[PDB]
């Protein structure tokens, strides 16, 4: 670890969708390291991120996941560059 992992991003997620799901659900593609549901004004906005062990798996999930209707709700899973990093040189 500590090489250059990459985290993706998702939008249009169903309320029910709990952090646990984001991880497990994605666990199918590969090993999920991080999984949280970004909240706004105290209310969720069907949005979150997911990190993997390898870079290929990160973008891979964006191809498999992206396009999956969760209970009749389509989501857009894409690669999220420069996701973290408060101090960039």
């Amino acid at each position: 670890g500590s090489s250059g992992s990459s985290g993706i991003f998702v939008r249009n997620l169903p309320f029910d969708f709990t952090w646990k799901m984001l991880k497990d659900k994605f666990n199918e593609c590969g090993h999920v390291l991080y999984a949280d549901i970004k909240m706004e004004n105290g209310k969720s906005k069907g949005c979150g991120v997911v990190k993997f062990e390898s870079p290929e798996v990160a973008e891979r999930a964006c191809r498999m996941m992206n396009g999956m209707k969760l209970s009749g709700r389509e989501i857009d899973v894409r690669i999220d560059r420069n996701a973290s990093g408060p101090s960039s040189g």
Side-chain angles (χ1 to χ4, degrees):
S2 201
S3 182
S5 59
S6 281
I8 71 166
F9 210 103
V10 191
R11 272 187 59 274
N12 200 97
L13 288 160
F15 302 126
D16 197 81
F17 210 80
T18 38
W19 66 275
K20 270 271 64 172
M21 293 180 80
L22 191 68
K23 173 205 198 276
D24 154 79
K25 165 61 89 209
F26 281 52
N27 203 239
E28 282 185 85
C29 171
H31 182 132
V32 177
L33 303 171
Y34 178 56
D36 196 72
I37 307 282
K38 299 280 172 77
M39 297 188 70
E40 191 158 85
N41 184 243
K43 65 172 157 273
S44 305
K45 323 295 270 91
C47 53
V49 281
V50 176
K51 268 90 90 153
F52 298 85
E53 288 204 324
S54 270
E56 59 183 53
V57 184
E59 88 203 46
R60 174 186 271 296
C62 284
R63 292 163 89 181
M64 306 209 291
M65 305 323 272
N66 197 341
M68 72 194 199
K69 284 202 150 270
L70 308 193
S71 206
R73 294 204 187 193
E74 213 209 317
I75 41 184
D76 271 281
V77 188
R78 293 84 153 295
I79 291 287
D80 206 308
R81 292 306 209 172
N82 278 304
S84 80
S87 175
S88 64

